[PDB]
Design an enzyme around this catalytic site. Structure first.
Site, PDB file in Angstrom:
ATOM      1  N   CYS A 147       0.876  -1.237   0.033  1.00 47.64           N
ATOM      2  CA  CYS A 147      -0.064  -0.106  -0.094  1.00 47.64           C
ATOM      3  C   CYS A 147       0.962   1.049   0.029  1.00 47.64           C
ATOM      4  CB  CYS A 147      -0.965  -0.047   0.892  1.00 47.64           C
ATOM      5  SG  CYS A 147      -0.593  -0.398   2.761  1.00 47.64           S
ATOM      6  N   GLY A 200       2.819   0.158   3.884  1.00 45.58           N
ATOM      7  CA  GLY A 200       2.965  -1.362   3.675  1.00 45.58           C
ATOM      8  C   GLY A 200       2.501  -2.390   5.108  1.00 45.58           C
TER       9      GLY A 200
END
Ligand code: A1H4S
Length: 504
Positions: A435, A438
């Protein structure tokens, strides 16, 4: 330990505690009981109390006028070991010196206040093991407590037993009828964990593990979700959060000067023991082995949990994908959200070819679905034709800027597809999941995938344990699963997955 977190305190109780029982440098943290994912750090200094806001919308704890952290324990560790670092709005240093310890037992795994005697007995009898224990409020003596403990072997033939130990509450301290009087039930349990009680005839009342009440049969998920929906979700999550102080594993490589600019957030770092080590780096590059990424191995499929690339880490990202033989990438952020960069574009435009240092990537074809885009990429090493492999990038695009989807169906369709792609590729390496930092969406996606895999193999008739699974993943990357909203969402996704298997 994590006693500086007080789950059930008001702003005014916090001030009163710090002013009456703390000194300058004393601090505690606490939730906002209205706004979830809002926390406050309260610190005494100069004879007064400051309240500093910590926000978490799903990706990290963001301390106002401070840094971003993967857990509150990591946040406290950082400032207790770095003076002059936490600063007031108008400049001054705020020192975190003396944790103000909380006496409240509600977040301890072993505390089951409400439990009655017979209810406690059946639980220990059926679910419990030798050294399994719990603490409950007394029914016969109000204000007192009961320690209940299973001891024996490992059918019902007398090899095992439950013993009950009365815990009195006397002018604000706890005891087992003699000896030391303790400031809290936690202090009492910690003491008798290290110094077990011995019965007159020599049975040792070893407190080995809290009774496990979170392991459920997958078929009964709906019934657990119902029970937890009566705010029990908050309770169960905060109990998990209390155990994060057991996971303060070293992150020394990410702290190296040479690696500082390879981290999106300077204090959100991979554990040393699970970090992805990159080999065959440029021999002119003093440190070419580092990426902010960790291997997540469930205890067939493994994951790499990583951050969104920086412009200066895109080449390292591709070296990692190639080296680990990964054939699937899961991206769970847009490139930009709320006008801020969450992940640079590390892939070429459709039909284009780009070199990323020694790696070459072709974007063969993009396919748009409702909640995601799929990019079929071809990855190879420059100068070596026979190294080409397809890498399928699944880019989830509809996750809300803050919080979580109100329905798990899109996420589950997406993960089903990711799973099948991975399973179709002989010898594929770990699935890369990233993301922004993360840890929040990334940990949420990985945990759902692990849980759903179990069910996928074994069926509705198997055991899952959501917080135990999360603790196992969090031992491999800091702060995996950030918020109670994500915690709830994991349960809602497993529930939804089960119901769709019953409808087929
Ligand atoms: C027993 C229990 N275990 C857990 C875990 C859990 C599970 C497996 C491994 C780890 Cl490390 C953890 Cl923390 C997370 N939440 C939990 C809630 C409870 C029960 N509640 C009852 C109400 N009072 C607070 C306790």
């Amino acid at each position: 330990s994590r006693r500086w977190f007080h789950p059930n305190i008001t702003g005014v109780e916090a001030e009163n505690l710090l002013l009456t029982r703390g000194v300058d440098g004393s601090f505690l943290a606490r939730p906002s009981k209205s706004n979830p994912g809002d926390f406050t750090l309260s610190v005494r200094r100069n004879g007064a109390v400051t309240h500093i806001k910590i926000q978490n919308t799903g990706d990290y704890y963001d301390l106002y006028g401070g840094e971003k952290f993967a857990t509150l324990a990591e946040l406290v560790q950082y400032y207790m070991e770095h003076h002059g670092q936490l600063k007031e709005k108008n400049g001054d240093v705020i020192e975190l010196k003396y944790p103000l310890n909380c006496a409240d037992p509600t977040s301890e795994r072993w505390f089951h206040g409400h439990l009655s005697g017979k209810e406690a007995e059946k639980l220990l009898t059926e679910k419990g093991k030798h050294g399994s224990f719990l603490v409950r409020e007394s029914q016969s003596h109000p204000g007192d407590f009961v320690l209940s403990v299973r001891t024996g072997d490992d059918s019902n033939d007398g090899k095992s037993k439950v013993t009950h130990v009365m815990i009195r509450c006397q002018e604000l301290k706890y005891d087992v009828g003699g000896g030391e009087r303790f400031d809290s039930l936690t202090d009492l349990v910690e003491h008798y964990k290290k110094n077990p009680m011995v019965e007159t005839l020599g049975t040792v009342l070893q407190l080995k593990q809290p009774l496990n009440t979170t392991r459920i049969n997958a078929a009964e998920i709906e019934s657990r979700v119902r029970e937890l929906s009566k705010q029990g979700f908050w309770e169960e999550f905060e109990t998990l959060q209390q155990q994060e102080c057991k996971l303060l594993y070293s992150r020394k490589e990410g702290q190296r000067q040479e690696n500082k600019n390879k981290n999106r957030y300077k204090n959100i770092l991979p554990f040393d023991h699970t970090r992805v080590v990159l080999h065959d780096g440029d021999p002119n590059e003093p440190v070419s082995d580092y990426i902010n990424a960790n291997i997540i191995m469930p205890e067939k499929k493994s994951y790499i949990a990583t951050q969104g690339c920086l412009q200066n880490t895109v080449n390292d990202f591709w070296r990692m994908v190639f080296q680990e033989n990964s054939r699937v990438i899961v991206m769970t952020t847009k490139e930009v959200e709320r006008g801020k960069s969450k992940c640079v574009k590390y892939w070429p435009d459709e039909y284009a070819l780009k070199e990323y240092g020694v790696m070459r990537v072709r974007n063969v074809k993009e396919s748009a679905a409702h909640d995601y885009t799929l990019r079929e990429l071809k990855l190879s090493k420059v100068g070596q034709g026979n190294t080409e492999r397809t890498v399928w990038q699944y880019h989830f695009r509809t996750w809300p800027d803050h919080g979580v989807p109100s329905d798990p169906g899109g996420v589950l369709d997406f993960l089903e597809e990711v799973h099948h792609k991975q399973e179709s590729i002989m010898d594929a390496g770990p699935v890369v999941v990233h993301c922004s930092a993360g840890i929040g969406r990334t940990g949420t996606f990985i945990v759902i995938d692990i849980l759903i895999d179990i069910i996928r193999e074994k069926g509705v008739d198997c055991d899952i344990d959501v917080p135990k699974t999360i603790q196992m993943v969090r031992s491999q990357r800091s702060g995996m699963v950030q918020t109670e909203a994500q915690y709830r969402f994991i349960y809602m996704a497993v529930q939804h997955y089960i119901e769709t298997l019953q409808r087929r």
